[PDB]
Amino acid sequence: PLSVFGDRSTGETIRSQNVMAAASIANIVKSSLGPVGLDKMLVDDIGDVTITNDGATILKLLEVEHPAAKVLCELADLQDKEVGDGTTSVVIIAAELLKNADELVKQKIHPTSVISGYRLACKEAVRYINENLIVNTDELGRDCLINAAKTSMSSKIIGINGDFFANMVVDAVLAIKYTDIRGQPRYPVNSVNILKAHGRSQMESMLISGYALNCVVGSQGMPKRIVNAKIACLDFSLQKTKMKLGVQVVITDPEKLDQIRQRESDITKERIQKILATGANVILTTGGIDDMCLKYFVEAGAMAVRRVLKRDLKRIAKASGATILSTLANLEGEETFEAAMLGQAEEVVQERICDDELILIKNTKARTSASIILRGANDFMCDEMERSLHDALCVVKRVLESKSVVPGGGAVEAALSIYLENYATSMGSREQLAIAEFARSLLVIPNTLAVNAAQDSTDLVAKLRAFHNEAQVNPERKNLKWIGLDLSNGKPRDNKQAGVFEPTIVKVKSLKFATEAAITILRIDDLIKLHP
């Protein structure tokens, strides 16, 4: 009757398929949650091997066919983009919410009522988190940042070495700190150039008090160490001059060909002479440099680096005070290069790192910059350290920007579950079931942590819920709001005292994104799949 060239699913079938797909995506990454979680290996069809614990990377690398699974994968990607941490918790929470909402729907509860209940529960959870479970970081000091970094690097390849990696992360983030208009301290992460090089152990990873380039000097005749570096940043190639498309050379008097050919290279020669005449020592360009210009730099005893990355060049110019010049043209139609466009550094060296060389611009002036050189056993290990390091940097940035943190280890989830199951009795008649299911779904995080720890999940979560219920009922027991999970010993523990923190924005964004994804999937009750 429809005569539609495709398959159709309607009613319970499509809802069950969507929930099964979401649950499968959840179960894919449920084994990499919490410090007792374990990494996974992803192998391509060409033999490429990837070892990672990050949920977003795992979901990006996998091939996904079902649209709901695609929704969850893009939810994880969005959570990574907007926050940088919690990319697994958001997926798990969204899948659990979808499962509980589908169970409610199978109980003949209309999906609109469930959606309204989920919206109310999300709003009240955000409000309760912002009003009760936040901890101000002003009175905690640098220990708060250290603990946040250590918590973020748990369940990662650099977990046990956290005592050192957290110091590195905090130092780098504080080094790249700057202030903008209206006095907001902004921390531009991704300005920390993360360099990888296998070899010696992790503890030999170096935090550079400057910048690091993954490139070497163009010529072997140039010195590989300059003390008082006058860095000149350029955005144009230094090679033989060639006329543009609209300019053509036509010779009628043969005596002028030699002069033409000489001028052709003398133009670049005089440009290099103008650049060197101001005392420049290090010359970095995004374009290439041919042989004669390299020799010109060699004879002057000055560095010259070609094919420098644009972002690296911009960072070097910003840190050292230099300005990038795409051309040597002033405001009076001449070629010139003043000393004002020269950045300065305390030292520029080409260091050797495991049979390979890289350039270290050390201790730039007028601005502090940082870079990290990661040393690992092999390439996969270095990649995983880089991913974990980026996650830690993002967490520290979130903590420094917004000065509120919340206890970790499922304490927030248990407190929210207790508060929501108490609050659901206050409003509505059919939405109360939805809010109760939201509270129950919020408990998937501590349960997953306990399961990963191979502990008694039921008893441990029951004890956590009892502690939080006592905290919420007794007004003189507010100190129990911080009772999290001690995964090493499998017992409840005051996580705020133990130093297990995480940014409030992580939880807020995870809750909002998971609620929106569950709502989006829940509206679907009919599928049409046209044949290709």
Binding site: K108, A450, A454, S457, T458, D459
Partner: protein
């Protein structure tokens, strides 16, 4: 895992172990329960299944639907097995057992996913089932008066309740009275083979009748049969197992003669043997002759000459029913055809029923058998009517064995769930969650009733829970009134043993499914 040139098991062996395989087993059980989910209750609907040969089976019976389903999942087969067990021991509740088991598994699935040890769940199921069975036995209503009228009414009400879910539910009182009447005439053992069920195409349901005797189809009459009278007013019936026709005396017999006089003597001797058997039958005084073995045309004409009715090739079960109704004895030899070995009925007659000829033996005062003659517009119609009447007959037989009844419509399960929740509120707490899950899963049947009827399940569930909590034992789902009502006063009655067996089988299936941790599938041999 490494290729390991020499391998342990046979190549192609599939193994699944851990929590995920248990979760998959639970999901398969839910899938099986969904296939018979909508067939429960007066508002239930039938299912049609087509086999490879193209035959279609229409049935509301859970056991039949599960049998026609070609399940291959090892965990899913347990639900079909327990449905078969419930059909065998009870005959009703085959849809309820699968739903109960699947709901148990669904309720305990979240605890399984979080690492709960299966043995705890098994122990909780055993304890809850024991308590529920004890409660059912305690609160079941029985009347220790042995009054014929009230016991008959109880049988009829149980039959109507067991019948008020099929396509014959419109005439449920009529068929219930027929079934109770048929069962009451069985002697001591209530053997199912003593209740003949004949299906005749054409005619309405109300045209179906119960015969106080035996009736069977006409069986390939020979020539000269139409010359026999087809009605007798006090016949004597000769129940025989004899081949009455000219034939070789023995398969290995050989006749050797060397004279034409001996040849004529031999042919006359064969004819005289046949005529002597027929003469003995005739002077036995019988007017109706029935035989397992064929009755030849010569014997048919001989009996027509004497104004008797004959019928050969009668099926064995039909002759057994005729013997038990008229009160004779099946004879392999006709030499001693005494008076006591002859059946007797008040009226014998051959009548046409929907394009078929049937022989009727009515008026038997001491008959111990019956004969259902079912009418309908299609063969599947008669098949489903026979299945429904079989369910009713089994229920009536069980009620005869013990008249212990509980109210239906989910009232018994509300009482059990309330009792189990009250018990679970008084234990440490590890078993409390599992017993509470069991009590919650006990609510599946009334919820399914409401869903099938098109109600709002949540409101009816809340009303039933509130009614049972503050007092009231037999309050269940009232389909017609869109509300709840006291089902015991509404005569929605169920034998207690039905629910006892249902709970026991569901609990055993759930425990067996949970107790399995690994599944191994050896590669198929001789695939052909």
């Amino acid at each position: 895992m490494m290729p390991t040139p020499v391998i342990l098991l046979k190549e192609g062996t599939d193994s699944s172990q851990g929590i995920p395989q248990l979760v998959s087993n639970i999901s398969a059980c839910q899938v099986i329960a969904e296939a018979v989910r909508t067939t429960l209750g007066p508002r239930g609907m039938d299912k049609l299944i087509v086999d490879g040969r193209g035959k279609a089976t229409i049935s509301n019976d859970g056991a039949t639907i599960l049998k026609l389903l070609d399940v291959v999942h090892p965990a899913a087969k347990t639900l079909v097995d327990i449905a078969k067990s419930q059909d065998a021991e009870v005959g009703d509740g085959t849809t309820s057992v699968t739903l109960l088991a699947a709901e148990f598994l669904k309720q305990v699935k979240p605890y399984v996913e979080e690492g709960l040890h299966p043995q705890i769940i098994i122990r909780a199921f055993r304890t809850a089932t024991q308590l529920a069975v004890n409660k059912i036995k305690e609160i079941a209503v029985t009347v220790k008066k042995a009054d014929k009228v009230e016991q008959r009414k109880l049988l009829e009400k149980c039959a109507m309740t067991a019948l008020s879910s099929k396509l014959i539910s419109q005439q449920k009182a009529f068929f219930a009275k027929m079934v109770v009447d048929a069962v009451m005439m069985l002697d001591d053992l209530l053997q199912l083979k003593m209740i003949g069920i004949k299906k005749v195409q054409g005619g309405a349901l109300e045209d179906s009748q119960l015969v106080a005797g035996v009736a069977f189809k006409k069986t390939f009459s020979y020539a000269g049969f139409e010359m026999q009278p087809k009605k007798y007013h006090n016949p004597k019936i000769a129940l025989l197992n004899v081949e009455l026709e000219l034939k070789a005396e023995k398969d290995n017999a050989e006749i050797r003669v060397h004279t034409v006089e001996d040849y004529q003597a031999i042919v006359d001797a064969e004819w005289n043997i046949l005529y002597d058997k027929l003469e003995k039958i005739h002077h036995s005084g019988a007017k109706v002759v029935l035989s397992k073995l064929p009755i030849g045309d010569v014997a048919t004409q001989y009996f027509a000459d004497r104004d008797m009715f004959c019928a050969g090739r009668v099926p064995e079960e039909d002759l057994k029913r005729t013997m038990m109704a008229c009160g004779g004895s099946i004879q392999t030899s006709v030499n001693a055809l005494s008076a006591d070995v002859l059946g007797r009925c008040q009226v014998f007659e051959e009548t046409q029923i929907g394009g078929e000829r049937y022989n009727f033996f009515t008026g038997c005062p001491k008959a111990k058998t019956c004969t259902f003659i079912l009418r309908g517009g299609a063969e599947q119609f008669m098949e489903e009517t026979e299945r429904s009447l079989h369910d009713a007959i089994m229920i009536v037989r069980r009620a005869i064995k013990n008249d212990s009844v509980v109210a239906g419509g989910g009232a018994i399960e509300m009482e059990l769930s309330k009792y189990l929740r009250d018990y679970s509120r008084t234990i440490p707490g590890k078993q409390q969650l599992l017993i509470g899950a069991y009590a919650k899963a006990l609510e599946i049947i009334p919820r399914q009733l409401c869903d099938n009827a098109g109600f709002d399940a949540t409101n009816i569930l809340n009303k039933l829970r509130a009614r049972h909590a503050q007092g009231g034992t037999w309050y269940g789902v009232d389909i017609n009134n869109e509300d709840i009502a006291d089902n015991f006063e509404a005569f929605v009655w169920e034998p207690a043993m039905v629910r006892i067996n249902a709970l026991t089988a569901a609990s055993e299936a759930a425990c067996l499914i949970v107790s399995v941790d690994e599944t191994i599938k050896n590669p198929r041999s001789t695939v052909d």
